[PDB]
Write a protein that binds this ligand. Structure first.
Ligand code: HEM
Ligand code: CAM
Ligand code: K
Length: 404
């Protein structure tokens, strides 16, 4: 625990560790939801991870994400050393500067590319699941959650599949560090990978995502090599470490919930709505902002330079935004969440993520409608900037399956 700064009142101290929260055994979202128990204030200070604010309620999380003048994304990760090294584009930038970079990123992961990749995405989901179906078991994280989004991203980026273990290791270290590497080290290694590739593709422009970024324009002027690297780095982290984790949370839930599975099997038109309700309940991102000036916010004196965690995961779990928030209800009339962010940094990869999730649900449930967690398995989770499932052993009776 970092020494309590003079400016922080002892009564607001709640020593939440975002990389190892107390009640993790009960599930990731459950462990973060302790921040929203009756007794806990809306804004707390933890002495963990060098010390930082945490907004615990949807209203404050939304407000701070909108007010980029006070809450800057220049230093968006805890611990401070990570936030300081963090320079990815567009996320490390505030408007006005930030927006011009979004359009270039959209050229590579936005709707028109999703429309282009839909065939390959569909084919891969089907191929992987058909492969597993007769086995009556899988390790879902390694057999599907990882390869399905990652092989598609590597194709899009024009990178060889043999590079996956190296790149996934690095992206993991930036989001759920195992202790072997600092954020700054992991970021620099990712940049080290990209530098020669960007140089090659600026000389011989191709069709892949790296070529597109590296040869692109922002607000009508050429992107620099440095800028391209800083955006390509971010795209790799998004591609390798977002949906990959989310799919495992969703599948863990469905493995324990045969009535929910049945609902989507009998009424497939519900699958898009169910996707949204799983995105709310199994929300998994928590980053934040840095104070640009001394600022009083909801009766708390925040100091210039203070870091504030603004967990995107908490907004939709807040009872003030959604009644019985820990309940998954596919008929929920108003699904309120900030799972994909809020304000000007709203996720640009959401068309891709939603497609990947919906395709998974549809293709899995049509072939393997009935499955469970392996008997005696205790599912371990890991918390971080993006939370994850360590392993998800699934089992089913092949006699309940059907080949398409
Ligand atoms: C379930 C899957 C995903 C979730 C929950 C998610 C969540 C988020 C969140 C919360 C933000 C805002 C970060 C902030 O304000 O500091 C964000 C931004 C971003 N995401 Fe996603 N993301 C997902 C998938 C993806 C994918 C597949 C990509 C493709 C590379 C991607 C690329 C990006 C980029 C480039 C930004 C930065 C936009 C900006 O800063 O202007 N994300 N995402
Ligand atoms: C918080 C994010 C999910 C968003 C895209 C990848 C990620 C870890 C970032 O650094 C910005
Ligand atoms: K920084």
């Amino acid at each position: 625990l970092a020494p309590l700064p003079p400016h922080v009142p002892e009564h607001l101290v709640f020593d939440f560790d975002m990389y190892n929260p107390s009640n993790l055994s009960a599930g990731v979202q459950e462990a973060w939801a302790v921040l929203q128990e009756s007794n806990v204030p809306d804004l707390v200070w933890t002495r963990c991870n060098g010390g930082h604010w945490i907004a615990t309620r949807g209203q404050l999380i939304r407000e701070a994400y909108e007010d980029y003048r006070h809450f800057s994304s220049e230093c968006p990760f805890i611990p401070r050393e990570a936030g300081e090294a963090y320079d990815f584009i567009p996320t490390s930038m505030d408007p006005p500067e930030q927006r011009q970079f979004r359009a270039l990123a959209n050229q590579v992961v936005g709707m028109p590319v999703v429309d282009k990749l839909e065939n390959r995405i569909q084919e891969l989901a089907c191929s992987l699941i058909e492969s597993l179906r007769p086995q009556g078991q899988c390790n879902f994280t390694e057999d599907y959650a990882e390869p399905f989004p990652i092989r598609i991203f590597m194709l899009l980026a024009g990178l060889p599949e043999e590079d996956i273990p190296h790149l996934k290791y690095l992206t993991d270290q930036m989001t759920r560090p195992d202790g072997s590497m600092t954020f700054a080290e992991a970021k620099e290694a990712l940049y080290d990978y990209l530098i020669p590739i960007i140089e090659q593709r600026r000389q011989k422009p191709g069709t892949d995502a790296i070529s597109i970024v590296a040869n692109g324009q922002v607000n009508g002027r050429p992107i620099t090599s440095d800028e391209a690297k800083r955006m390509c780095g971010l795209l790799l982290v998004g591609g390798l470490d977002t949906v990959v984790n989310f799919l495992s949370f969703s599948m863990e839930f469905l493995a324990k919930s045969p009535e929910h599975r049945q609902e989507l099997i009998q009424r497939p038109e519900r699958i898009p709505a169910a996707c949204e309700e799983l995105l709310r309940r199994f929300s998994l991102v928590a980053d934040g902002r840095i104070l640009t000036s001394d600022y009083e916010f909801h009766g708390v004196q925040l100091k210039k330079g203070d870091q504030i965690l603004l967990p995107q995961m908490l907004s939709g779990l807040d009872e003030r935004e959604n009644a019985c928030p820990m309940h998954v209800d596919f008929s929920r009339q108003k699904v309120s969440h900030t799972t994909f962010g809020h304000g000007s940094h709203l996720x640009l990869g959401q068309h891709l993520a939603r497609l990947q999730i919906i395709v998974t649900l549809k293709e899995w449930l049509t072939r393997i409608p009935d499955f469970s967690i392996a008997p005696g398995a205790q599912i371990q989770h890991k918390s971080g900037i993006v939370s994850g499932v360590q392993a998800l052993p699934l089992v089913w009776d092949p006699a309940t399956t059907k080949a398409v």
